[PDB]
Subunit: 202 residues, 6 copies
């Protein structure tokens, strides 16, 4: 075979993949009880009642299908949208009908620096009949304020993917793009973190 | 083989490919009598007397070589330029020396929606010795005003390529690309742009 | 095999590759005595005493490892930084401990025009344990003022790479990115040449 | 994109693809009323009552699912097996429950010669959850007796695939395998044609 | 990214990869105390005193470097060679200097059938400066006697790789070769199993 | 980019590539005055008067087109055939109309060993409209008598390609291919084969 900085995830039912969710067009991940994060350009395409699916892997199944109950955009310029779902599944996952028993939120990392290895996990290919999760690895190029840039292979559906460090702790949320190219994430500054904690379902 | 969102067009002498023309560096397509559409960043590299070729495919031939007679940039910000050609071919196509007999313009689509399948058809590799036409498929991500964004594999030479729906109706013109399933950016034909184009079709 | 607009350089100890240097995260190239060029977003990550390596190729060796002695960013908008190194190698090259005897600066080309063939030569993959030099070919799309655009396969590490014409003369410096994509360089205008000549070590 | 001697067939419900059928592990194609052809190493894995599907394409549907009613191996050395199916579909195709109304047999070509372009049409990837038909093009290298050799990209599932000329006429049946490799088929000699005609369901 | 039936193994220090060993040219795996298996065409290239390395992964290290003490070829036609190593490492692994503490032998599977998923694990690229383990997945095509055939992407260095089922139990040893091609293994018949058990170091 | 054991040769007008010739379906290489070597399964598709081309590279030109004048198969089992050409080019190369002035034969290597790096140089894609020369690198797996096996990416058209060591000396002729790092099979030049070739070089 060959070196490859992106590979298909064959088992999406183990951590960290159990923190990731699919939209028809994009990716999101869990941040707290009944609460997911994605980009604003993703959430504009959705409304209350639309469905997300928890860590799906084509016909190997998933953690359940859930409906969106609230969409809250961050008021700053950063591309962050908090989405709450109804806790009771439309279709159950293997751990039952409760959203939170089928998913796992991430710990925030202590920080991030140029040169460290990150992973972007998400559903790179939008509007497919089957959901396939890919893991894209690469180094951090820069952390400046609320901007984190890394070199990786990312595609349009990665919008909303978590960016994790080597210990599966959260360093960012992807928003825009062999391919070892600069790719762009929102780094969680204290003001963004505060907006998120405030909009987690209580 | 493998899934691939871009493949070589092996017969460019059937519809929809007989709508598409090649520049040395880019793509365009036919909009009406003696008239083609491309981007402003393409037309700035050309002038009256420069040559375009109709639906070429390496040494399989083409629908003729024609000279440019007029360049008319759209006055708005969108990246659209109208180019008229001399009707009399420099080199004939199989349907003769008249440009219009060797090409086919597209019908406009009724609109376009996020999630629908499009195709971008054009000459993705600029400044080659042989013209090779590729078809790039993918879903529309967004339509907002004159901006249409789709996820596809497009390349530098695709500047000017038509963006068609599943029934080969026109939804846009490609202008920028900034596996590969990447957001790619077209001009959606709003009424103001359609009016400009209609007014600049050779009479 | 297949047509490919980017291939691995297997001997980096011949011209023009002997004008190219590696940073941990990016590329640069020699402009004069003890002096290299790169981008401003590359030099931001380095400081006096950090190290660059002269035309490395995996474990086939290199022209030596050298320390940075001064960093001078171009005052204009263009993404150009001049870096001077200590002349005395930290680790020697095959031609000895003097930086200048192990490298080769480029001649400026007379100019550059749309459609001509260029090559971008550099270390495309950032933060690797081994330095691998690739050569990316493609045509110039546009030259205007200080902006040169070409169609090529470039990646995040190519920041700082020379852009040469078919006679290995210098037409620009890469700064931003099959793939036949528009890629962007700084074209050396008289004002930029003047800044560079003024900042070559004496 | 790139030159490629193998591409996915996106509509398998037009000629010539309507002459091709799938087994779980391999390909076959229609030779006459209720009758298909494949290799002897394919038919070894099947029995009466096993199922084949007519020109499937993922979830875009198919020409119907049919049961095997008889397996007849060619007495000679050549890797040819005739399989008859029950005429009445287990699951219908768009043209109804009759096998014959949903498929199309091929005309034999007048012959075949070195350098002419052929196509091998079949299901290259064995034992998949979804059937994906690919078309592999390439030139004939040699024809001798019952042996036709061509240069193409074929894979293990292509056992049993038709080999057609540029007018979709039949020149052989694949049996054994960028990749532009010599690939091997059975050329239909008069003795083989005679066996086949004798074993077409009446 | 894309579907791929072969991927780089990033951590070779967990089971099942801790059963695999590298030769300069090929692969082998552990069958018992101080004892490995490979092909006869591999062992002909080695002699007492030559080195094998336990589950290496470029510069991430390995389970130790060990010397060959005995080579015993199976007397039948099948491509099987038992190699014993000196128990005391030339260079230790993380579990110390004893060969057997750094490696793990496999359980034989109860049998194997057409259509089941297998994995071939080994070092596909011979005579490299760094050892990179790849995992190639695919279905079993046939089990006939001492022959097992599967559809996979295998390369010259895979000679000697174990072929494992989905529970990491042993089904074969690879000996000869997108690429989904038939690939050929020795299936462990009782007579082969007896030869192996008889030549395990006591 | 990526590691790749096969790449396109961009200048076929330098050594070692000026040793290699193209058939419509296969490769060969020069062994001496007016004489080339290929496989028996290639030469059986050719006859006196058929044309080979010297070191072509698409439209960059070539060292001339020459006609075959004699085919002499090796009497042993190994897959070797000697082909002589008419010395006077049908179409000249840059060094003129004489075949020998436009090509270069190889020196034989002193031998070959498992683990050493070789190159297979040839025209891997048969029956194309344009001749494209590729170089496939990889290690020797085994040498036994007249059999040399190496791990490389070779294709149908590589039949007849020379197999050279790191100093461009001849170690073998490729005959069969049965990423891709696969065992590939050449004829190693034993003394009996060398003698046959020397005796069949045009005088
Ligand atoms: Cl980039
Ligand atoms: Cl993108
Ligand atoms: Cl582009
Ligand atoms: Cl082959
Ligand atoms: Cl195969
Ligand atoms: Cl192999
Ligand atoms: Zn490989
Ligand atoms: Zn956005
Ligand atoms: Zn690439
Ligand atoms: Zn395939
Ligand atoms: Zn523009
Ligand atoms: Zn990709
Ligand atoms: Zn090839
Ligand atoms: Zn910058
Ligand atoms: Zn591509
Ligand atoms: Zn790409
Ligand atoms: Zn392309
Ligand atoms: Zn068979
Ligand atoms: Zn290949
Ligand atoms: Zn392959
Ligand atoms: Zn992808
Ligand atoms: Zn063997
Ligand atoms: Zn393939
Ligand atoms: Zn690369
Ligand atoms: Zn032969
Ligand atoms: Zn491969």
């Amino acid at each position: 075979g060959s070196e490859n900085n992106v590979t298909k995830v064959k088992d999406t039912n183990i951590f960290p993949y159990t923190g990731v969710v699919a939209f028809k067009s994009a990716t999101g991940f869990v941040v707290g009880k009944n609460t997911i994060l994605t980009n604003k350009h993703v959430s504009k395409n959705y409304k209350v009642g639309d469905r997300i699916t928890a860590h799906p892997n084509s016909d190997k199944g998933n953690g359940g299908i859930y409906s969106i109950k609230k969409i809250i955009n961050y008021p700053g310029k950063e591309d962050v949208s908090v989405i709450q779902v109804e806790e009771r599944a439309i279709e159950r996952g293997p751990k039952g009908f409760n959203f939170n028993d089928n998913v796992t939120p991430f710990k925030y990392a202590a920080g991030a620096k140029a040169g460290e290895r990150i992973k972007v996990i998400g559903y790179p290919h939008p509007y497919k009949n089957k959901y396939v999760l890919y893991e894209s690895t690469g180094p951090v190029m820069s952390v400046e304020g609320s901007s984190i840039v890394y070199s990786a292979h990312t595609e349009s559906g990665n919008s909303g993917s978590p960016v994790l460090n080597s210990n599966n702790e959260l360093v960012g949320i992807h928003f825009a793009s062999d391919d070892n190219r600069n790719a762009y994430g929102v780094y969680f500054t204290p003001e963004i973190k505060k907006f998120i904690a405030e909009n987690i379902d209580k």
